[PDB]
Amino acid sequence: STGSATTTPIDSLDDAYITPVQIGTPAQTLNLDFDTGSSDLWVFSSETTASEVDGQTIYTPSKSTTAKLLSGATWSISYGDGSSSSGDVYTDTVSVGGLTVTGQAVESAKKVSSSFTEDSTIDGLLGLAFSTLNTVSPTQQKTFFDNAKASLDSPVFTADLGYHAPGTYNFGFIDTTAYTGSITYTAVSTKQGFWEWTSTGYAVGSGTFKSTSIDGIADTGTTLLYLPATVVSAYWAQVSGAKSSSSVGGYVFPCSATLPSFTFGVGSARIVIPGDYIDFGPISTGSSSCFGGIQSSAGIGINIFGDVALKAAFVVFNGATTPTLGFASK
């Protein structure tokens, strides 16, 4: 079996991407944030505190003839940004782009943090990291990909995120028309539950490539590219007027600037992030100071190849017995 679904930026800055997911019988369609950095499928629901719901589409399990309360099960998660959510658990039928899993754990929110409430375009998350990170207690639950794996033509999913435009998540096959040249595969560590790999280095604009090992995670659920402070300093040094701002919380730059590209290494291959992808617009409405898309990972504790990097590539999440990651230009 295979599945294929279109993923859409939630706003003009590509702050995140949503993908339609069918849950329950009859189908209830929710727009979820596919997140290769976490492993819970959770949704706004009929159970969510009313004051915490503001424009989102909810899952109503009492209206699904295939929904079953998972007795005694609860979940609670806190994300790298500082947001969180929690509730109970149903099992139900979940389909993505024509691919169906029966008995998927659907985590129903009773509480969500303000940042979720304030984001009317995201109805929940669909986690695609490794199931070892799933927060359901007392019995851990499997991710959608893990449940589907055995049925897929090939145990893979691919992420093809667009710059200011729609893209695609495919399950079970590689669309050879979606990329240029070849796919370079690179080793993955699952020891932290993430799609964790090691980049072979970087370049800034037309500058010389610096060979250096950068350990990080491929994370569709993170907007920006978070790298070591030395690397990030080297990048913003090439932008006149750029500076790290304590008050804003990162590197900012004059909106009139033209940004250089940023290249990262995958083995001997190279992925080029166009400079336009690194512009996240005014820090506040009407300001001529703009927020940068490459930021320091110091104090995160891990480097993050988020959307800024991944949308410059066709990315293969290979879930074979020994997982690997593949990157191609497009």
UniProtKB/Swiss-Prot annotation:
Keywords: Aspartyl protease, Disulfide bond, Hydrolase, Protease, Signal, Zymogen. GO terms for biological process: proteolysis. It catalyses: Hydrolysis of proteins with specificity similar to that of pepsin A, prefers hydrophobic residues at P1 and P1', but does not cleave 14-Ala-|-Leu-15 in the B chain of insulin or Z-Glu-Tyr. Clots milk. Residues 17-328 form the Peptidase A1 domain. Disulfide bonds join 255-290. The active site is at 35, 199. GO terms for molecular function: aspartic-type endopeptidase activity. Coiled coil: none annotated. Its EC number is 3.4.23.22. Belongs to the peptidase A1 family. This is Endothiapepsin. It comes from Cryphonectria parasitica.
